[PDB]
Structures are given as C-alpha cells and as structure tokens.
Ligand binder design. Structure first.
Ligand SMILES: [Cl-]
Ligand SMILES: [Cl-]
Length: 129
C-alpha cells in the first residue's frame, strides 16, 4: 500500500545539522500519520517525532529527550516527510527510519513502534564529537 524511502544521512560534526527526507508512495498520503524512529547500534528502536494527518491539522509530537532540536514536517503534494535535526550531538548517532500508519491520523500511543504499518529502509547518521 505504502512505500517509504529515506535519504539525507551521513557523517556530520557535533553542533551541525542534517535534514533527512523520506519519499512515500500512496494515493491518500495526506490521511496517514508519519513518524521518525532511530536505532543506535546495540540499542532498541527509539521514537523521535510524529506528524498527524492533514485533516487532523498536522500536529507534531516529539520525544522529550531531544530538547526541541528536531522538527518534523510533511509535504502532501510531494508525498514526502522531513526531519530537520539541529545542534547535533554524538548521541544522535543512529539509523533513522520513517514509518507510516494508514489506519490512524493521530494516536495516544504515537511513540509505539508497533503502531505503524509501513517502514522505510533507514538512513545512517554518525555525529562525530
Ligand atoms: Cl524535542
Ligand atoms: Cl517503541
């Protein structure tokens, strides 16, 4: 139903910034909730940010630990979602994944990885000290 493909990762210096993007396929994209998760090597998948479907106003959720440094956005015309990552720190080193729900517009349990029905391939990020 939905395909997702992330880009924009790489090696960046602490204090720098990166914009990740995910290109999606799917007729009714605007009706889906989208999220970014990250997984540092050796660690479990961690919620980063989510964005509501557009009919619900496109509200945004963030994990508290990240101190407002990240911003999620969506472009419904292009069927893309972006993660602007500012003031990067070595702890931000991870594989970043985009995920979609075609069932929910928003959710109480937006941070649960089990909620999402589609996942991208990941984009790799290293933040050097
Ligand atoms: Cl935050
Ligand atoms: Cl989770």
């Amino acid at each position: 139903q939905v395909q997702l493909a992330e880009s924009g990762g790489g090696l960046v210096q602490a204090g720098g910034s990166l914009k990740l993007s995910c290109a999606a396929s799917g007729r009714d994209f605007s009706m889906y909730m989208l999220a970014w998760f990250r997984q540092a090597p050796g660690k479990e998948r961690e919620f980063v940010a989510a964005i509501m479907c557009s009919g619900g106003g496109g509200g945004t959720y963030y994990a508290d630990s990240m101190q407002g440094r990240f911003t999620i956005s969506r472009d419904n015309a292009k069927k893309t979602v972006a993660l602007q990552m500012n003031s990067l720190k070595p702890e931000d080193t991870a594989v970043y994944y985009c995920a979609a729900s075609t069932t929910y517009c928003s959710a109480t349990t937006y941070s649960s990885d089990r909620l999402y029905d589609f996942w991208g391939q990941g984009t790799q990020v290293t933040v050097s000290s």
